[PDB]
């Protein structure tokens, strides 16, 4: 169950990670490892290596081409602040049309993304409106919680460390919907601060850029 | 209200005059609910409906707020719209302005799949109506297992759909309730859609063929 996740690592399947690092990462105490791009073979190869360990393993499906059976959870982004229906339901429709019959709905959890960094690749691809004040962001969180009833609302700051006060304000609006935070977490203090408000804190880039610090984020959140 | 129990509902257009006689027969018909689809005029119609014992719902299509006094507020989300404003845009605007004083316990989302291109709703929302049964089933799954909406709404407004298609959609849904609306003018048409749809919606027929529209209730109930 995702509700228990407090710290998760996110691995880029196009980025290499040696076996000794993968071991240290998977046995670090993190609650889950998310594979997030991407080819189907590389996704399967990485999964097989993770399965050496007992850590829950999830796939974040950003493109149907890399959709792979065998994961514990399928995290499905909905870009709530996108200007294009494509990134809100369109691509989802295409994927569900083709693969819906083989999907186990118990393993699928939608993530109501609110992409907040304009300089990020995700923002540009999805045509996200990042010019948002806290009230805008709060409105999205409330939509996720009450109207769409998504399992997850996800504040995505990508390569920048977000505003902890915004994360705190969003949390107040949420309840049944879980609050995920991602963005520029490199130090344990950064991890700890966001973890005070976010249900679940996601650590990605630091894995490749500052591995030892990335490992330290676990205890900072979980202790 | 426990909307899962609804089998038959009447939908009234507040811009179309309805006399007290027909309103009363409708409200006392045994229908599970009367859905209302100027603010002082909506309130007037509400008050007239309140003289009886039938649940009254407001389907909200404009940013906002919600006119107070209804038992249930129904919020359409047009899943097959090609524009984000009909899926999240206007909903975001509304929640931003009025979200601090909204009672979500009285609000139910309707995952709409608009299936008649000739209607105003389809044209306004830029709905993709050219959908095969697989397309519609895909929307039904999105409504229940990605989005988690209590209602998936097949809207053929004016035209009578294929009951076989409605059967397939129902077979794809689990906990999400299937509403059907479209061209129901006879009790036979109502009963046949009612064996697959959880809830059938009778609208137009109220105005041009009242006796037959009234007869749709018993057809569904029996």
From Swiss-Prot, chain B:
Catalytic activity: sn-glycerol 1-phosphate + all-trans-heptaprenyl diphosphate = 3-heptaprenyl-sn-glycero-1-phosphate + diphosphate
Gene that this sequence comes from: pcrB
Keyword annotations of the record: Lipid biosynthesis, Lipid metabolism, Magnesium, Metal-binding, Phospholipid biosynthesis, Phospholipid metabolism, Transferase
Name of this protein: Heptaprenylglyceryl phosphate synthase
Pathway: Membrane lipid metabolism; glycerophospholipid metabolism
EC number assigned by the record: 2.5.1.n9
Family in the record: Belongs to the GGGP/HepGP synthase family. Group I subfamily.
PANTHER family: HEPTAPRENYLGLYCERYL PHOSPHATE SYNTHASE, PTHR40029
Species, as recorded: Geobacillus kaustophilus (strain HTA426)
InterPro entries: GGGP/HepGP_synthase_I, GGGP/HepGP_synthase_sf, GGGP_HepGP_synthase
Binding residues annotated for sn-glycerol 1-phosphate, in chain numbering: 11, 153-158, 183, 203-204
Entry's Gene Ontology BP terms: glycerophospholipid biosynthetic process
Cofactor: Mg(2+)
Binding site for Mg(2+): 13
Annotated disulfide bonds: none
Subunit structure: Homodimer.
Function (record text): Prenyltransferase that catalyzes in vivo the transfer of the heptaprenyl moiety of heptaprenyl pyrophosphate (HepPP; 35 carbon atoms) to the C3 hydroxyl of sn-glycerol-1-phosphate (G1P), producing heptaprenylglyceryl phosphate (HepGP). This reaction is an ether-bond-formation step in the biosynthesis of archaea-type G1P-based membrane lipids found in Bacillales. To a much lesser extent, is also able to use geranylgeranyl diphosphate (GGPP; C20) as the prenyl donor.
Acyltransferase listed as a keyword: no
Any one GO MF annotation of this record: prenyltransferase activity
Pfam family, one: PcrB
């Amino acid at each position: 169950e995702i509700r228990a996740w407090r710290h998760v690592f996110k691995l880029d399947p196009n980025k290499p990670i040696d076996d000794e690092r993968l071991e240290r990462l998977c046995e670090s105490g993190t609650d889950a490892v998310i594979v997030g791009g991407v080819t189907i073979d590389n996704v399967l190869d990485l999964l097989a290596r993770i399965r050496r360990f007992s850590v829950p393993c999830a796939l974040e499906v950003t493109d149907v081409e890399a959709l792979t059976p065998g994961f514990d959870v399928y995290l499905v982004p909905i870009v709530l602040n996108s200007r294009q229906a494509e990134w809100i339901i369109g691509r989802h429709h295409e994927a569900v049309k083709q693969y819906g019959d083989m999907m186990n709905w118990d393993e699928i959890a939608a993530e109501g993304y609110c992409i907040l960094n304009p300089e990020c690749k995700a923002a540009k691809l999805t045509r996200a409106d990042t010019e948002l004040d806290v009230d805008d962001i709060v409105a999205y969180a409330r939509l996720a919680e009450h109207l769409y009833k998504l399992p997850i609302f996800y504040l995505e700051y990508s390569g920048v460390y977000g505003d902890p006060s915004v994360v705190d304000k969003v949390k107040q609006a949420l309840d049944q919907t879980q609050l995920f935070y991602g963005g520029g977490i490199t130090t344990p203090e950064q991890a700890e601060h966001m973890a005070r408000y976010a249900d679940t804190v996601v650590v990605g880039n630091a894995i490749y850029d500052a591995f030892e610090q990335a490992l330290a984020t676990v205890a900072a959140v979980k202790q």
